[PDB]
Amino acid sequence: SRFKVSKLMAYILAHSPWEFGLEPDEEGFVSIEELVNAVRKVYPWVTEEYIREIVERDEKGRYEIRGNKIRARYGHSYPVILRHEEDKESKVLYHGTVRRNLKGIMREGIKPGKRQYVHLSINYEDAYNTGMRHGEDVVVLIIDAECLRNKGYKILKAGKKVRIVKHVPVDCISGIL
Amino acid sequence: SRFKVSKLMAYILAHSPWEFGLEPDEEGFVSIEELVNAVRKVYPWVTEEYIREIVERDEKGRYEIRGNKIRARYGHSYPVILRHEEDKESKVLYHGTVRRNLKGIMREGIKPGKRQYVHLSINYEDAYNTGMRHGEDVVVLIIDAECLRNKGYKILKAGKKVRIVKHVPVDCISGIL
Ligand SMILES: NC(=O)c1ccc[n+]([C@@H]2O[C@H](COP(=O)([O-])OP(=O)(O)OC[C@H]3O[C@@H](n4cnc5c(N)ncnc54)[C@H](O)[C@@H]3O)[C@@H](O)[C@H]2O)c1
Ligand SMILES: NC(=O)c1ccc[n+]([C@@H]2O[C@H](COP(=O)([O-])OP(=O)(O)OC[C@H]3O[C@@H](n4cnc5c(N)ncnc54)[C@H](O)[C@@H]3O)[C@@H](O)[C@H]2O)c1
Ligand SMILES: [Cl-]
Ligand SMILES: [Cl-]
Ligand SMILES: [Cl-]
C-alpha cells in the first residue's frame, strides 16, 4: 500500500538512512533512485513514479523532492539544517502533549528537547494526533503566535500544517483543550 | 485511543453502517475514505493513516483492506456473504460459552443461531475471553476439527485466530475446559 511504503520512506529518510547505504546531505536530501532501490529491498513493486505520487498526494507535505533528490522536510531523529519559509500569517497554533507534561510546560514553557525545534500545528486535530504518540491522556495547548514572534522567535513552515519554533515560553500559551 | 476508535470502527463496519451514510457491498466492504469521514464525526483527529495502522496492528486481523475498501472480516450483526479460505491445518479448535448453555449444546451441538456460522477459535485463551461476553461462568469446548472435516464440514479462516463452521455436532466436542 502507499501507507506502508510511506512508513518505510519515513524510517529511511528521517531516522536510519545509513543502514541502507544512503548519505543524506546536510539538509536531509538523498538521491531518489538510491531511495527507490532501498524501498524495493522491502517492497519490490515500488518505482520512482510511485515515490513521486506519494510525495505529491501527501496532505502533510512531509516529503520534498528537489531535482532527483528527496527528503523528509521535518521530524528527523538526526541533526539536519532546516532552512524553511517563515510563517508570518498564523495568529494561533497548537501543541499536542499528554497531561503529565503540563507541570513541566507551565513552569518551563515548551522546550524542543532533543530536536532543534518545538513542533506546532495550525490545526488542533493534527496536534492531538501527534500528542497521542506519548499516551492516551492527550491535551492540546493553544499558542499565541503573534506573542511568540513579538518575543523575537521566528516561526517556520516545516510542512503544510506543521510549524516549528525554537521555543514557546509560558507567556505565549493561551488555553488548554 | 486506539481502543475507542477500533470500537467505533467495529460498530460502524459490523453493526450500523447505514446510520453513518455508508452502503456496504454484499461482502460488507465500504470505501476507506467514507469510513474515515464517519469515524471523524466522533474522533475528528482520526486519519486514514491511523485507520490503516489499526487494521495492521489488530491482533485478530478482524479488518480487511482491499484496495481503497475496508470491511470487518466476520462478526457482523447483519447478513453478509462470506468467501474465506478453507482452514485445513488446524486439528483442534475452541468454543467459549457459559455453563448454562451446556444443556443446549450437548443436546443439539453448537448452533449458529442468528449468524450464518458458529465461531471457533484457534486459541484456548481467546475462546475464554469471548465466552466472557455471555457471563462470568465460562467454559471452553474443545472441538475435534479433523472430525468435522471427516463429517463433511468446511472450516474457514474468517480471521487470523477465528475459524467458522456451519454447525458443530455433539460427536465433535472432544472436551470441556
Ligand atoms: N506535538 C505537536 O503538536 C505536533 C505538531 C505538529 C507535528 N508534530 C510532529 O510530531 C513529532 C514530534 O512529536 P512531539 O511534538 O511530541 O515531540 P517529541 O516526540 O520530540 O517529544 C517531546 C515532548 O516533550 C514535551 N515537552 C515539551 N516541553 C516540555 C517541558 N517543558 N516539560 C515537559 N515535557 C515537555 C512535548 O510536549 C512532547 O510531548 C514530529 O515528527 C513533529 O513534526 C507534533
Ligand atoms: N465463541 C467463541 O469461542 C468465539 C471464538 C472466536 C471468535 N468469536 C467472536 O465472538 C462473536 C460472537 O461469537 P459467539 O461464539 O460468542 O456467539 P454469539 O455471541 O453469536 O452467541 C451465540 C451463543 O449461543 C451459544 N450456543 C450455541 N449453540 C447453542 C445451543 N445448541 N444451545 C444453546 N446455546 C448455544 C454459543 O455458545 C454462544 O454463547 C463473533 O464476532 C465471533 O467471531 C467467538
Ligand atoms: Cl517519523
Ligand atoms: Cl491575512
Ligand atoms: Cl463486534
From Swiss-Prot, chains A, B:
GO terms for biological process: tRNA splicing, via endonucleolytic cleavage and ligation. Keywords: NAD, Transferase. One of its GO terms (molecular function) is NAD+ poly-ADP-ribosyltransferase activity. Pfam families: PTS_2-RNA. The keyword Cytoplasm does not apply. Its EC number is 2.7.1.-. It comes from the Archaea. InterPro entries: Ptrans_KptA/Tpt1 (IPR002745), RNA_2'-PTrans_C (IPR042081), RNA_2'-PTrans_KptA (IPR022928), RNA_2'-PTrans_N (IPR042080). The keyword Cell inner membrane does not apply. Gene3D superfamilies: 3.20.170.30, RNA 2'-phosphotransferase, Tpt1/KptA family, N-terminal domain. Belongs to the KptA/TPT1 family. PANTHER family: PUTATIVE PHOSPHOTRANSFERASE, TRNA 2'-PHOSPHOTRANSFERASE 1. Removes the 2'-phosphate from RNA via an intermediate in which the phosphate is ADP-ribosylated by NAD followed by a presumed transesterification to release the RNA and generate ADP-ribose 1''-2''-cyclic phosphate (APPR>P). May function as an ADP-ribosylase. This is Probable RNA 2'-phosphotransferase. It comes from Pyrococcus horikoshii (strain ATCC 700860 / DSM 12428 / JCM 9974 / NBRC 100139 / OT-3).
